[PDB]
């Protein structure tokens, strides 16, 4: 499987929930980001496909106040803007 390299701010977010490396598979990037969203309770308790991130570092990195987990192409594009070229 192909390895990708996070920029310094995205790297610090993954290491806050146990990550130990400088490079990752895309399945590993999605594992640590999901664990981050659930331990900080950023998902809406009633409608659980909505993530609210205005007052979190995740909102500064992605450039939005909120997003839907149904929008698969938009989420892969937000991750790509945060990888080393």
């Amino acid at each position: 499987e192909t390895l990708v390299r996070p920029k310094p701010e995205l790297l610090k977010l993954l290491k806050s929930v146990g990550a130990q490396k400088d490079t990752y598979t895309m399945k590993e990037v999605l594992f640590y980001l999901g664990q981050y969203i659930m331990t900080k309770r950023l998902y809406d308790e009633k409608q659980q496909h909505i993530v609210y991130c205005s007052n979190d570092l995740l909102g500064d990195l992605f450039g939005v106040p909120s997003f839907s987990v149904k929008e698969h192409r938009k989420i892969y594009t937000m991750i790509y803007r945060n990888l080393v070229v």
Binding site: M26, L30, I37, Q48, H49, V69, K70, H72, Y76
Partner: peptide, 14 residues
């Protein structure tokens, strides 16, 4: 939970 089931669908696209 419902969040974990929506997030598993992204995993399928990798």
């Amino acid at each position: 939970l419902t969040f974990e089931q929506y997030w598993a669908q992204l995993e399928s696209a990798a």
